[PDB]
């Protein structure tokens, strides 16, 4: 059943799984008509589908064009998601096919299993963990790609970099949770932190910058400050 | 008018005859039940009152021969059986008459229920949903799981209702997967309708038989069967006007004849309420939308 706190070393096995974040793939500006109405204007998304423990992430860009003509864009959005999973499995050979995919949001539960009929043996997967992929267009690189498409377009990153040759793949998702929970809650202050030495830069073949092991150190601190002192004032506490 | 006499009655229990019942004592003369009327399928039944655990019973129709009810002391039950000698039935029946000892099937002129609960039932599909070939009548009780149930293990004794399940491959085509999960129309009038029941009347009686067996013998599987067909209807944007009209006059005397205290065991809260307020069909079951919402508004 639910992915949870209890399960958490699951995640870094040697059963293949993929989670499966929604939260970009339908995204609009809400703006005033000349006649005083409201109206959105979709943007570029993205399904966000990536292996915790290999880091590999498989970036579907969601395009306007599918829009076209849709009505109830949110529920089709997550029988899109579905579709578009479902054909990547089909796409990937046999023994790379996952066992698991877990979903990020409950709401892609029907959705996924109706499209993964095929694939009785895939088990379909919330979680209970509240993960911050919803701040994965905060990594400029992938806000780049989703945002330039002019067509539907698959990008394959890996979203560890190279730190699995320095760390396992635990403390590889547990940096990377840090580092998006801090993107997701004050985006400015989390991209000083990264970016504030200029002497550490961004490989091109690469999306976070090239820190050393003690320079990891000092960004995870400062990573976890930010998030506390936001936490302060969200609540008063 | 038909007759069910009973052998004898040696073990105290209560005695329905569709829709009607009557309590008998341990050794009370009592031999049976006369004016059974003819056209209708129609169910005894029994609960002992030393074991109210296992309601059980037989369906049958007079037209298909004679029957009558003998208790068991071995097997521990009241059984039917089928009396081949035409001449030996008639007499039995004479005298248990003569001597005033059966109740008559006590139907009011006016009253249409058990009609209107049984208008789509017909033994010949009791007996492919129930199998057991040697016998002209079927037997059911409490217990009995279904083909279904089974799935997710005596295979004799099982309900082989028609298997609907929403998320199978029978009721989904390749590439129209958000069509037809949030659409059933393909799966209601193609698979079910044309494909395995070939019309609507055999549709109903099905729905019909499993609502009977779940309110008779509070049979678990036969409820599922039940909602499983209502909502099928429900969550199907394109149904024919005749079949909605009927499910309509179904439902409302199903809702009619349940009994005021099981409704919170035989109603699924999820089910009535997403056929009454949010599906396709949610404005054309006006009898059953006004007799659920005056008699079961804590439900909904």
Redesign the interface.
């Known amino acids: 059943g639910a992915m949870n706190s209890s399960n958490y070393a699951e995640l870094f096995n040697n059963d293949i799984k993929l989670f499966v974040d929604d939260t970009n793939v339908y995204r609009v500006t809400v703006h005033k008509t000349f006649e005083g109405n409201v109206a959105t204007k979709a943007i570029n998304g993205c399904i966000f589908t990536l292996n915790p423990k290999t880091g590999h992430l498989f970036l579907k860009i969601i395009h306007t064009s599918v829009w076209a003509g849709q009505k109830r864009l949110s529920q089709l959005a997550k029988w899109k998601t579905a579709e578009e999973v479902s054909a990547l499995v089909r796409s990937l050979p046999k023994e790379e096919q996952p066992k698991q995919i877990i979903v990020t949001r409950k709401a892609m539960l029907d959705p996924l299993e109706v499209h993964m009929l095929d694939f009785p043996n895939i088990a379909i997967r919330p979680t209970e963990l509240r993960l911050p992929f919803s701040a994965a267009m905060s990594i400029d690189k992938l806000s780049d790609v989703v945002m330039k498409a002019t067509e539907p377009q698959m990008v394959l990153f890996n979203i560890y970099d190279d730190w699995l040759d320095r760390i396992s793949s635990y403390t590889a998702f547990s940096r990377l949770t840090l580092l998006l929970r801090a993107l997701k809650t004050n985006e400015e202050s989390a991209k000083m932190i990264l970016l504030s030495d200029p002497t550490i830069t961004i490989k091109s073949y690469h999306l976070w910058p090239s820190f050393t092991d003690e320079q990891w150190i000092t960004i995870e601190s400062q990573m976890r400050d930010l998030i506390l002192t936001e936490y302060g004032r969200k609540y008063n506490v | 008018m038909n007759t069910v006499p009973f052998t004898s009655a040696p073990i105290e229990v209560t005695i329905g005859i569709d829709q009607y019942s009557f309590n008998v004592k341990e050794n009370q003369p009592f031999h049976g039940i006369k004016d059974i009327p003819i056209g209708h399928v129609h169910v005894i039944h029994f609960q002992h009152a030393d074991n109210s655990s296992m309601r059980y019973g037989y369906w049958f129709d007079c037209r298909m021969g004679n029957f009558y009810i003998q208790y068991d002391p071995k097997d521990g039950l009241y059984k039917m059986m089928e009396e081949r000698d035409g001449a030996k039935f008639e007499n039995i029946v004479h005298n248990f008459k003569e001597r005033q000892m059966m109740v008559s099937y006590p139907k009011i002129d006016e009253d249409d229920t058990w009609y209107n609960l049984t208008e789509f039932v017909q033994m010949d599909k009791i007996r492919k949903i129930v199998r057991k070939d040697e016998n002209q009548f079927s037997y059911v009780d409490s217990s009995m799981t279904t083909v279904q149930e089974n799935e997710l293990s005596d295979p004799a004794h099982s309900l082989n209702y028609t298997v609907i399940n929403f998320?199978?491959?029978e009721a989904?085509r390749p590439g129209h997967?958000?069509e037809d999960?949030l659409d059933k129309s393909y799966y209601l009038n193609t698979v079910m309708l044309q494909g395995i029941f070939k019309n609507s009347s055999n549709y109903f009686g099905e729905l019909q038989f499993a609502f009977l067996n779940a309110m008779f013998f509070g049979n678990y599987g036969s409820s599922l069967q039940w909602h499983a067909m209502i909502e099928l209807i429900c969550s199907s944007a394109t149904v024919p006007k005749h079949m909605l009209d009927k499910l309509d006059e179904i439902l409302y005397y199903q809702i009619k004849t349940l009994p005021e205290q099981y409704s919170d065991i035989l109603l699924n809260e999820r089910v009535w309420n997403i056929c009454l307020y949010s599906s396709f069909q949610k404005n054309s079951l006006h009898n059953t939308e006004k007799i659920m919402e005056n008699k079961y508004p804590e439900l909904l």
Request: proline share 0%; aromatic share 14%; no cysteine.
């Open positions: 998320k199978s491959r989904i997967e958000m999960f």
